[PDB]
Structures are given as C-alpha cells and as structure tokens.
Design a protein around this ligand. Structure first.
Ligand SMILES: Nc1nc2c(ncn2[C@@H]2O[C@H](COP(=O)(O)OP(=O)(O)O)[C@@H](O)[C@H]2O)c(=O)[nH]1
Lengths: 419, 52, 430, 162, 332, 48
C-alpha cells in the first residue's frame, strides 16, 4: 500500500519543479497567472470541471512536460471522484502556498494594507498608486532604473489583463508567489517587500539599528575557510538559538493547542485583543503575559524572542508565531474553506460578522454545539467581526482527524451550508 | 538473503493480523479488546470507614 | 575461553576453509582482516577464535598441516586465504600414498615436532585455554596417521583440557579408495583411547540431505563442507554470545557421556528447507523439534529407529520461551518412550542463546548419543575381515614396518566397542 | 566527546615531530592502547578501569544500524525502559577542559579525576578556611517529627512549615 | 575481441601504508579472473568466477573492486593488450558553446554510449585569443577525452546537436587549451546562495553522470561551476569531518572518495540546499526504493556507502564546501 | 597554538551535534510513514 505514498511524494516534487520552471521562463513573476489564464479559470474559487487531456496540454504549452507516471500521480492526488475530471484551481493553490512561513506571513501582511470592496475585491488604482519602485533593492544598488521596473509592473497589472478593474486575493497571492521564487532566501524577500510596499511597516527606524539587525540575520551568518574564532562563535550562537527555538516550539507548544479548536481560537483572541494598531505586532512583556495565561512557557525569554522579531525594533510578530505553531493545510481543503468564505458580505478592512457564522452552522450533538458557542462567543469577538485566518485556525485541528479528502468534504457539507 | 530494513518492517507489519500472534504473544498478556481505566489507588473496593 | 583449531589432510583443509569463511562472516571480518561489522556483540568475544595483529587486522588461531602442498597452496590462494598466518603452514615434499603406516611412522615422525612447536606456541600465549578442535578424514592416509599421532601428542601434553574431533568416515555405497577399511580400523582404535568427544559424518547422508531436503540440482563438495561448517560453528555458539541458559563444551561432555568409552555422537541442523518452500512455512519451536528428530536431517547413515537414545543435547539460538522448549522436549520423550533408555529419568538437555545465525530468525543444532552407530563400525569391520583373510594389500603396510599383530589388536578393540554399545541397547533394569 | 577530536594529533606535536611513548598517547599508526593483547572493545584485562576514564570515547555512531535492532539480549529487553529515561542527561566538557583532562594537569595522585566529582565547586569555595576564622566570627552577625516516604508525609511537613 | 587481458595494478594498503603491485588476468571466454604477485612470483587467487567484472570496464587508469580491495589499473602487462590498445591513447577536446549548456547532459551520455573515456572536464571562460583562434564562445564547457576510433565517432554530434559542438584534433591546439582551460587559475563559482553536489567514483565508472546532470537541468537548477578532482586520503577526511561520529560508514566513505576521481557540481536556485536535498533523497537507498522511488539515489545507489551522489546537509557549510572544491583544490 | 586549536574544535563539535539531531529526527519521521499501510473491510464494502 506504499504506492499511494510514493504518488504523494511524487506530487510534492511535481509542484516544486513546476514552480521553479514557470518562474525561470519568459514571464518570470507572471508564470502562474499565465498558467491560470491558459487553463481557462474564470472564477477565483469555482468548481469548474476540466478533463485530464486539456490539463496536460495546458501544462505542455505553459512549458512543463510530464510523462505517464507524473500524470498518474497528479490524477490520483487531485481527482477525488474517479470520473476522469479534475479542477485546476487545486493545482494552482498547490503552486500558490509553496512557501516558507515568513514569506506567507509578509504576503498576508501586505494584502491587508489595501481597502477591500463589498465582495472582497481590491481596485487596480489603489494597488498601482501604492507601489513604490524607488525603494526596489535593484534600483538602490543601481543596476537598473526606476522607469524600467515601473513599466514592467504596469505591464503586470493593466486593463487588458483585468478588464473589470478589480483584483482578487488569489490573483495577488499568485503574483507574490511568482515574485518570491526569484529571490534567493527570506532576507531578500523581506528587503524587497519592505522597500516596494512601504505601508506594511507603520513606523520608520534609523539605518544603524536596521543594519545591525541585518548583519545578525541567520542568512548572513555562515562559515568560511579563513574565519577567526570569535566570528565562528557568533555563527554558532545564532544557529543554536534558531534550532533551540524551533524545536522547543514544535515539541512543547504544539501538543497543548492542537488537540482542540477551542484552545486555538482562545489563543488567537488573546493575542489579537492586545493589538491596537492592527499590524500584528506586540511588545515582549505583553507576549509573555499572554502566553503565561494559556499554559505555555519559555526557559529564556531574551534568547527565545530574538527570532520572532522581523521588524528590527524589539517587537514580536505573532502572525509568524501562529504560522510556525500550526501546520499548513492541504490546498484542496483551503479551496473548500475559501468557497465557504465567498458567501459573506465584507467591510472596508476585510471582516465578516459572527451572526453570519451562527446562522450557517448545523451541529449534531450537544458537546459540539457547546464548544462552537463557547469559541465563537459574540461578546468575546473583537468588534463583532472575524477574519478568514480565524476560520482556518478553527478548522485546522478538525482537519487532522481525517486522512482522505472525501471525508473532509462530507464533514464540511454536514456541518456547514452550501459550501 | 534479507531485503534490508523496510521489507522487514513491512513483513512484521503483515504478521500481527494473525490470530496466533494476537492471542499468543511472547512474554506478554494478550491485548484488551476494549479500553480500561486504572483508578488512582488501584483496583478493588476501598475499605469502609467508621466513626472514632 | 579460546579454542585452537588443527586442520589435517585434504578433507580437513577443505572443510576448514569454509569454516573460517562462515566464522569471519558472523563476526564481520573482511577477507583483508579489517573489522567491518555492525554490532558491538561481534567484537566482544572475537578473542575466542581470533588473535589480534597490529592495527586493524585479526588473525585466526589455526595450524594447517598437509603432506603435499597442493591443497595448502589452493587454500592460501582462495579468497579468504590471506588471513592465515604464513608461519602456520607446515608441509612436506611427498605424499602419504594413501597408506596409514607411511603417514604415521615414516614422514609423520619427520614433521610432527614442528607441528607441536607451533601448537605449543599458540597454546601458551592464551590466557586460559579451552579444548582443541580437529578436522580430518579417517579413510585417507595423511589425515588418519598424522591426525591420530597429533591427537596422541596433544593428549599427552594437555590432559586436563577438552579433546574434540570432527571426522568424515568411509561409506560402502560410494568409495573413492580401495584400502579404506584398514585406515579406518586403525584410526578408530586410536580415537577411542585418545579422544574425549568425537563427531562422525557420512558423505552419503550429506548427499541425501542435498538431494531430498534442499533439492539441489547439482550439489558440490563446497555444499557438503558448508553444512559441516554450519554445525561446527553452531556447537560453540554459547561460548561467544550471551543467552538465557549458558552452556559449555565441558557441560556438554558431562551431560552426554555416561561412561568414558561411549563418546561418539550424531549431528543435525534443523532449519534446512528449499528456497521454493520457504514462503510456505514459518519457523517455530515445534517445527524445529520435528525436523530435529527426523532421521532425514541426520548426517550419518544409521537411523535412530533401530536403536535407543542414551542422551541428547539441543542448543537453540534465538528469542523464544523456555516453557515451550521444556514441554516440547518432555512431549517428545513421553510419546516415543520406548526409544529412550529407561534408567535415566530425563535424557535431553536444552540450552538457549539469544543471537541467531545471520539471516535465520532461529536455529538449533542437535547432538545425539545413540547405539545405532554400531552398525556403521560393524560394516567397516566386515569389509576389513573380507580383505584381511587374503592378505589383499598388506605388503605395502608391512613394508613400511607394521607387525600384523597391530591389525588383530585394532580389530579386537573396535569389536569390543561394538559389543559395548550393543549390550546397553539390549538390556533390562533388573 | 562526539567524534573524538581530542584523541587526534595536535599541531604542536606535528611541528615538533613528537614520538609516542614519552607521553603515551596512542594516536600514531601501529600503536594502540592494548589491554590484555586486545583493544578495549574486547572484554579482556583491565577494560573496566580504562572505560572509567574521563577522556574515554566509544566509537558508536548516533544514527543506529539495523542489525543492532535485530540482535538484542533478553537482559536488554528487560532493562530498556530505565535506559531510555537514563540517557536523557550526561555531563559535557568543552575542548580546553578536555585538553586539561588528557594532559592530567592538576591532580593529587595520578588517578585523581576532579572533573567527575559533583562536589568540586563547593570544595573550591570551602578551600582556604581556618578553624578560628569560622569559629570566632563577629558575635553580632551570628519541629514535630514526621515519618515515612509517603507523599502525604511530605505534604504535611510542608504545610506545617508554611 | 580478446581471449585474455593482462594488466598490472597497485593496491593502497591502509594497514601497512605501502603500495603493492599485482598482475591481473581476465579470461573473456567464461568471465573468470586470476591474480599473481610480481614481487614473490606466487599465485594470489585461482581462476574464480566474478560476474560483476565486465570487459568494458577494463582500461588504463580505471578502478575495480575485487574482494573488498580497490585495484587501480596502471600499465599493460602483456603485448597482446598493448597491441589491442595501440590506439585509444590520443587526447582530443570537444567544446560546448553557450547554446549547448541546456543539452550538456545528453552530450555526455552520448559520449559514454560511444565507448569514450573522459580524462578531464571543466566549465571555464576562455581568453579572447583562443576564443578567436578556435572559434568558440566566451563561456563554454571543455571536455578532454580519449578512446578507440575517436574522430569518426564524434562526427555524429554535428547532426544530433546542430551548431553547439566544436571538435579539436590538432595536437598544438590541444596543448594550448590544456595549458589555458585547465590547470591553476580562477573559477566561476559563486560564494553565496549555492549548493554543491558530488558524483562518487563508482557512479563515474558506471557512467550515470550525464543522466544526473540532465536531471538537474530538467528540474530547473542552474549549474554555475563544474570540474573533476582527485582526492587524497587526507583531503577525503577533511571533506567529511562533520560526518565523523554521526554516520556508521565514515571510514568506508573515506576510502570510497579516495578510491578515484570525482565530479563536483554547483547548483544555484531558490532555497538551494533544501531543494537539492529533496531532489537527491534520503541517505539510505532502502528507504528510497519504498517511499521515494523517483529520487536520484533510488536509481543510482545500492547502499549507504555507495548511494551515488552527495549533497550538502547544513546550510552553514555551502560556501565552505564550494571553496574547498573550487579554490583550494583547483588553485593549488 | 594548542589553545587556539581547541577554540576551533568547539565549533566543529557544535556542527556535529546539529547534524546528528537533524538526521535522527528525519530517520524517526520516515519510519512513522509505514504505520497505517493496511486495508480495512469497510472501504472494500464501500467500493462494492
Ligand atoms: N565432505 C568432503 N569430503 C571430502 C573432501 N575432499 C575429499 N573428501 C573425501 O575424503 C576421502 C579422501 O580422503 P583424503 O582427504 O584424500 O585423504 P588424504 O589423502 O589422507 O588427505 C574421500 O572419501 C573423499 O570423497 C571435501 O572437501 N569434503
């Protein structure tokens, strides 16, 4: 019965290779969008059905060649009905979320800086005006010029590409996944995103603290043949701190929270309540006091919190902490949850009301109704509004109880309505 | 010839479904067919108390 | 607790080469002599058979003797041959001529002192010496004469140690040499006085094992010598690995021999089964016990069903329960009670060792002391009596110098051995 | 320590072309610490005392092999539960302290191992103390029994103290 | 063909630290071998069957393994073999221009199918004088090779791969490119955001090297450097310092890497070390054959010592290994 | 000189520790992937 797991590993390798090949071609950051346009996708999260031969010829014209065994693996993973038909949005989702947690954190952070419409879309005028090409690291080091990068970005988003004039979340994530595959590592992506999208960071800081934080990043600390003893020791200290924080989080904090949706939801509420700027940052003492109230502890707060500081000012990024704490979901289940999310009206900052959740739920036993009402209390919600990440975190522990995606389909249809 | 470790692990995985391996293991009590809970003080009735 | 091996003549040297292959494999010794094993359990008793030379290498505590160097040059030239110490190869310049008297009296006394010098050099270096182990054939020329000569010298020099022999003996069904009965009779006369324990194997039984049990299409002498090397390496297993019920060569001797002349044993090894069949039957202690007592699995032509067991021993290798072992040995003793000597209350000793041979989950070697061995010696004595009445080839032996009185003495001693075995088979408790 | 690295040749020894026996460190080819004619891996001679050394290292890879799993003794199966818990903690030294241990610098007698003594720091603080200085300090500056190992006894004693 | 080959080989003895010489004979009618000792005039091994040894692997400068001994073929021991190898000793150069870097793995595989032995390889950038004289591009791959009927065989690359190969046959141009392309000098390897993959000697003799390189190209990675180097025992030890005390096959890896020449490639991509580790697979081929059947080590590996390829594990050492391969070994 | 050598050997040992931890974690993770490679009767009944 190891053929299935061989197929799954092959699917992961296929996703890796497809992401590298598309972004290295003629259209670098626009490869995934071009693939989606070629496949014939017209709805962002629709359930349009597409037959296998058209999918393989679409990938062939995109620039990726697959023989029989990779086609079989893709069909096995994606076709959940056995009818010989599949939905390419699952493959595009698999290409979309293949990132390290820091990249996903900052990609999510940039998206909420915009002004969202009645139906979750964002206008093209705002995203065109909010781009700042002067801060591109390519321009600052003086390899290319501002006009060139401005022209290429304007060609990326134009009236012929999007006749309606509104960009969805999925399209922006596809573009950011494209532009992420060209950067070398996490630090390059952070520098590019900070320089290009300036509204992401709310307060500036001097170049001295920024350069000291940049020099101490794990990417720059790396061995060499002609090193001296002190700088070897510095590299050792940085690497040991990163390893200890990662393994203590994974070994200790995850088993406490992953056993029930109630714990995840309550921890998310506790973290989000203390945020006043709504930029996913907290002070150190506030973070330690929040974690103390939920039976999670650290052996050395000064060394442990130096890796959750992705802003360089001494704050704590709890979005990255929650991303590292919980495991990512498979793309099919994420598509299911986004199809559920489509049925909610949204305000200017991208939230929906909790009453909408309440009138769309249908439990079976008393215990699950009690847990749902306790977690999704109207009084405990921030401002009677909830976001999509809260839904993802609530559904993550339930998704770990099933191995096949058809079971998750059936449970979603039973619990929820329409989707 | 032995086909390494993965084949051996799967071979032992296919073995325990035998009834003999279930009801007759080596140096062990055969496993229970339902869950049991061991009380804090152990099994048996606690001794009844009386007034001083 | 270290053993010193001696290999004599063509048969002995050939079996020895396979034995040292099997032992080097079990302890993970490369044919260059470098340790390449994969568990500490291999290293921790390596001293038992190997001495350590400087660096990586280990050298095997063995003396190689032959009268013409052809075999010795073949063993030195073999794939594992390099491991052997060069100074340990002793050879002459002319053959035994298939003559016992030549091998014992003329060239034997010429070489024998250098062999004792090497054996003494090896023995006195040991911190505590266990018994000697010797492989030779009784039907040959150099095998019989120098093996029994050397056995006598080592028995003079180390009377408090153990004396163990493995010996191949002529069958009437497929003889390779005409004068086999004389050499066999004189050698059995020497062994019954000198030895502490002697193991006997028939080539006919190894052919029947190969053809019927293993269904080999074209077995070769390498296979027969591999089966023998398997049993030889199995008897010593408790010396060199941990276990739940340890055993020792001296403990085997004390439990098996009731009276000092009754020291001749049968051999078997149980998990023999063809590659096609292995998918159809799992190993277990009842299955091993059933093969273990099946005469199909015994390495002599005499069958247990015509005699009775005085004593037997079984050494088990592997992880198994002692209850199942004890009750299996009891059930076999109770169900077949007429084949067990009644004035001994329990005839079988068991022993259990944790570490099986590589690629087997479990294995057992069986040693049996049964009166049916008398038929084999009787057959050899018949052929001797047919040949001796007519002086058929005697002038060769007399020309070397033997008195005819030796032949009548050797016949009388072998006939007395047969009589001693036959009387205990046919007896009552009274 | 892991991988040895303190049994190997030092640069000073290589530059000075030092030989073996003046200091008797077995690193040069053809020389090895032979106990009873064999290495310390074999149970002959003085293996128990040589394994008790502060600088002893056994060549066991952290990543285990298959035959180690297959070949196990009954005693190991019996006592493996305690071994898993007992393998959690072990003392460790840095490289300078290992150099000091190998060079056996500060010892009262040749076999004195102070780095394996758990009471060494309190001995160091306790050193150089005189009877009068302890006994003649400044005069201005200077329970119901409970029996049993039962946790109830400990709880009662702690409650009384509080 | 032949009825009997004869070579003399040297065997590096680790216990003695001497170099011993033997005489190796191969009988092609029934595939048996036999070894003699030159210093003693005595037999080392009878005629014994050895099916893992094939006549195709017998050439000068090759390495073979006979009963856990690594033998290196040194010189012809007979005049029949000397006459049979009267050719196959001239060295020629084939270049791959810029348009052919995407097809270089197939080029190397095609050369291996043509019974051609590569004696050196490097990815270089030539001076302008040789660039104009020979007719090649600035950035090119230089392959040095020898074999039987070499010129007539390499003529097929003009029609299989149009306009991406240049063949050199004149000895003077070969000497000029040998002095210029190879030897001490600079390198094109980067010093950050890189990974190093090493092709083991056994895969070199078996010849899966072109398939490995072409798989790397197909997956999307970029090759920024490439060369072949021969490692001494001390160099092999210093290359595998971090694997001491961690894996059980340290000494076997040392002797395998010191057995013969090895190819070293450099890979640059996004998250290069993790991506290369994922594409190569786990350390043990047994796990690969069950759970990761598409990995490189599943196809080109038989055990832990001879898993085919070697890849960097810690992201702290990628510039260290790149430097050790492309500066310390190359320059001096 | 010997003291400086020890100062380098420290970092070497630290790298060895990190590698050993990673390899043990991966080896344990691989063996847990063979746990549930079994087929139950319920799925077979569902197919029928
Ligand atoms: N089992 C076995 N028997 C052998 C072997 N070589 C020879 N024999 C037998 O031993 C007898 C010949 O004895 P031999 O060893 O030549 O006596 P020697 O001349 O004194 O050494 C014949 O019965 C052969 O069949 C062998 O390798 N294995």
């Amino acid at each position: 019965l190891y053929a299935s797991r061989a197929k799954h590993t092959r699917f992961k390798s296929i996703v890796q290779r497809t992401r590298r090949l598309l972004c290295n071609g003629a259209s670098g950051a626009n490869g995934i969008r071009k693939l989606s346009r070629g496949c014939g996708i017209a709805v962002d999260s629709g359930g349009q059905s597409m037959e296998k031969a058209k999918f393989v010829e679409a990938l062939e014209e995109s620039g990726v060649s697959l023989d029989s065994e990779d086609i079989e693996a893709i069909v096995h993973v994606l076709d959940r009905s056995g009818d010989g038909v599949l939905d390419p949005t699952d493959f595009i989702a698999a290409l979309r979320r293949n990132l390290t947690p820091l990249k996903l954190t900052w990609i999510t952070r940039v998206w909420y800086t915009f002004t969202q419409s009645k139906d979750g879309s964002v206008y093209i005028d705002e995203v065109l005006s909010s781009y700042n090409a002067a801060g591109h690291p390519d321009v600052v080091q003086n390899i290319r010029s501002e006009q060139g990068v401005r022209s290429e970005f304007e060609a990326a988003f134009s009236t012929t590409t999007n006749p309606d004039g509104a960009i969805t979340r999925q399209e922006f994530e596809q573009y950011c996944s494209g532009v992420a595959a060209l950067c070398a590592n996490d630090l390059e992506f952070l520098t590019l995103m900070r320089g290009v999208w300036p509204a992401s960071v709310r307060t500036p800081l001097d170049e001295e603290t920024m350069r000291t934080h940049r020099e101490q990043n794990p990417c720059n600390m790396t061995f060499s043949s002609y090193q001296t003893a002190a700088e070897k020791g510095a590299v050792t200290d940085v690497r040991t701190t990163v390893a200890v924080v990662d393994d203590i989080i994974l070994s200790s904090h995850r088993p406490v929270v992953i056993q029930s949706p109630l714990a995840v939801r309550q921890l998310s509420i506790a973290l989000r309540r203390q945020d006043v700027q709504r930029n996913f940052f907290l002070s150190r003492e506030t973070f330690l006091e929040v974690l103390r109230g939920h039976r999670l502890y650290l052996k050395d707060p000064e060394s442990a919190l130096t890796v959750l500081d992705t802003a360089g000012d001494g704050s704590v990024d709890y979005l990255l902490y929650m991303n590292l704490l919980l495991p990512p979901l498979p793309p099919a289940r994420l598509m299911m949850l986004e199809r559920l999310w489509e049925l909610f009206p949204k305000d200017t900052c991208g939230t929906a009301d909790v009453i909408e959740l309440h009138k769309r739920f249908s439990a079976e036993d008393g215990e699950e109704q009690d847990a749902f009402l306790t977690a999704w209390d109207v009084r405990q919600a921030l401002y009677r509004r909830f976001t999509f990440e809260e839904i993802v975190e609530w559904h993550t522990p339930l998704s770990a109880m099933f191995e096949l995606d058809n079971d998750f389909e059936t449970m979603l249809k039973k619990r929820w309505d329409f989707s | 010839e032995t086909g390494g470790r993965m084949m051996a692990l799967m071979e032992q995985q296919l073995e325990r479904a035998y009834l003999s391996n279930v009801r007759r293991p080596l140096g062990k009590v055969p496993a229970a067919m339902y869950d049991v809970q061991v009380p804090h003080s152990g099994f048996g009735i606690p001794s009844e108390k009386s007034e001083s | 607790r270290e053993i010193v091996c001696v290999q004599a003549g063509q048969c002995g040297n050939q079996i020895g080469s396979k034995f040292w292959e099997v032992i080097s494999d079990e302890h993970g010794v490369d044919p260059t002599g470098t340790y390449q094993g994969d568990s500490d359990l291999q290293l921790e008793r390596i001293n038992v058979y190997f001495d350590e030379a400087t660096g990586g290498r280990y050298v095997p505590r063995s003396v190689l003797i032959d009268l013409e160097p052809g075999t010795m040059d073949s063993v030195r030239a073999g794939p594992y041959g390099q491991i052997f110490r060069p100074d340990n190869f002793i050879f002459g310049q002319s053959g035994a001529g298939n003559n016992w008297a030549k091998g014992h009296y003329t060239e034997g006394a010429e070489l024998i002192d250098s062999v004792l010098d090497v054996c003494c050099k090896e023995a006195e270096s040991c911190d505590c010496l266990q018994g000697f182990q010797i492989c030779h054939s009784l039907g040959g020329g150099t095998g019989s004469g120098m093996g029994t000569l050397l056995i006598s010298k080592l028995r003079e020099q180390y009377p408090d140690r153990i004396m163990m022999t493995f010996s191949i003996i002529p069958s009437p069904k497929v003889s390779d040499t005409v004068v086999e009965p004389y050499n066999t009779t004189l050698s059995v006369h020497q062994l019954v006085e000198n030895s502490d324990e002697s193991m006997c194997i028939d080539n006919e039984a190894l052919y029947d094992i190969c053809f019927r049990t293993l269904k080999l299409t074209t077995p070769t002498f390498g296979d027969l010598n591999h089966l023998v090397s398997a049993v030889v390496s199995g008897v010593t297993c408790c010396l060199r690995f941990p276990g739940q019920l340890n055993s020792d060569l001296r403990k085997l001797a004390v439990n098996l021999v009731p009276f000092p002349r009754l020291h001749f044993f049968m051999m078997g090894f149980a998990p023999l089964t063809s590659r096609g069949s292995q998918q159809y039957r799992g190993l277990s202690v009842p299955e091993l016990t059933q093969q273990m007592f099946d005469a199909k699995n015994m390495m002599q032509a005499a069958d247990p069903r015509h005699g009775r067991y005085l004593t037997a021993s079984a050494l088990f290798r592997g992880r198994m329960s002692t209850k199942e072992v004890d009750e299996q040995m009891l059930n076999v003793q109770n169900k077949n009670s007429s084949y067990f000597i009644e004035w001994i209350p329990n005839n079988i000793k068991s022993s259990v060792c944790d570490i099986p041979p590589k690629g087997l989950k479990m294995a057992v070697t069986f040693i049996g002391n049964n009166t049916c061995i008398q038929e084999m010696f009787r057959r050899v004595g018949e052929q001797f009596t047919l040949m001796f009445r007519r002086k058929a080839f005697l002038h060769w032996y007399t020309g070397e110098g033997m008195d005819e009185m030796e032949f009548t003495e050797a016949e009388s001693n072998m006939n007395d051995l047969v009589s001693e075995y036959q009387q205990y088979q046919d007896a009552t408790i009274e | 320590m892991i991988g040895g690295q303190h049994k190997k040749e030092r640069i000073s020894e290589r530059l000075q072309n030092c030989q073996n026996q003046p200091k008797n460190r077995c690193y040069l080819p053809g020389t090895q610490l032979l106990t009873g004619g064999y290495s310390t891996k074999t149970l002959q001679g003085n293996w128990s005392e040589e394994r008790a050394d502060a600088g002893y290292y056994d060549g066991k890879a952290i990543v285990p092999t298959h035959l180690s799993k297959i070949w196990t003794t009954e005693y190991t199966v019996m006592t493996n539960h305690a071994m898993k818990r007992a393998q959690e903690q072990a003392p460790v030294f840095d490289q300078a302290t290992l150099v000091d241990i190998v060079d056996r610098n500060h010892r009262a007698y040749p076999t004195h191992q102070p780095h394996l003594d758990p009471q060494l720091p309190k001995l160091k603080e306790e050193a150089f103390k005189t009877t009068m200085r302890t006994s003649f300090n400044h005069p201005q500056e200077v329970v119901r029994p409970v029996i049993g190992n039962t946790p109830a006894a400990q709880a009662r004693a702690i409650i009384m103290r509080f | 063909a032949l009825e009997r080959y004869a070579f003399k080989v040297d065997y590096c003895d680790p216990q003695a630290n001497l170099v011993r010489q033997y005489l190796l004979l191969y009988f092609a009618e029934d595939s048996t071998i036999e070894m003699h000792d030159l210093k003693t005039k005595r037999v080392f091994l009878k005629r014994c069957a050895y099916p893992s040894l094939t006549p195709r692997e017998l050439f000068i400068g090759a390495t073979v393994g006979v009963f856990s001994r690594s033998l290196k073929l040194v010189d012809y021991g007979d005049e029949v073999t000397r006459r049979h190898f009267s050719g196959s000793e001239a060295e020629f150069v084939v270049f791959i221009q810029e348009g052919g870097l995407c097809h270089m793995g197939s080029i190397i595989d095609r050369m291996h199918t043509w019974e051609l032995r590569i004696t050196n390889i490097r990815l270089v950038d030539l001076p302008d004088s040789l660039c104009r004289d020979l007719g090649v591009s600035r950035r090119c791959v230089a392959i040095l090779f020898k074999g039987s009927n070499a010129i007539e065989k390499v003529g097929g690359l003009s029609t299989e791969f149009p306009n991406m190969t240049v063949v050199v046959a004149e000895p003077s141009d070969v000497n000029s490119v040998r002095g210029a392309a190879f030897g001490p000098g600079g390198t094109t390897a980067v010093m950050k955001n890189c990974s190093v993959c090493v092709i083991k000697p056994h895969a070199i003799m078996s010849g899966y090297q072109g398939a490995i390189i072409q798989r790397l190209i197909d997956e999307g990675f970029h090759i920024t450097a490439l060369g072949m180097y021969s490692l001494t025992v001390a160099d092999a030890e210093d290359f595998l310092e971090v694997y001491n005390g961690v894996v059980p096959e340290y000494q076997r890896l040392v002797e395998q890497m010191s057995s013969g020449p090895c190819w070293a490639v450099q890979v640059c991509a996004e998250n290069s070390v993790s991506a290369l580790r994922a594409i190569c697979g786990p350390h043990d081929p047994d796990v690969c054959h069950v759970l990761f059947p598409h990995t490189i080590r599943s196809k080109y590996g038989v055990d832990r010592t001879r898993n085919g390829v070697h890849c960097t594990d810690l992201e702290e050492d990628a510039p260290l290994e790149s430097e050790f391969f492309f500066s310390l070994l190359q320059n001096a | 000189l010997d003291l400086v050598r020890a100062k380098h050997d420290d970092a070497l040992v630290a790298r060895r520790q990190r590698l050993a931890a990673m390899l043990l974690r991966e080896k344990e993770e691989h063996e847990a992937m063979l746990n549930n490679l079994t087929e139950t009767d319920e799925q077979r009944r569902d197919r029928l």
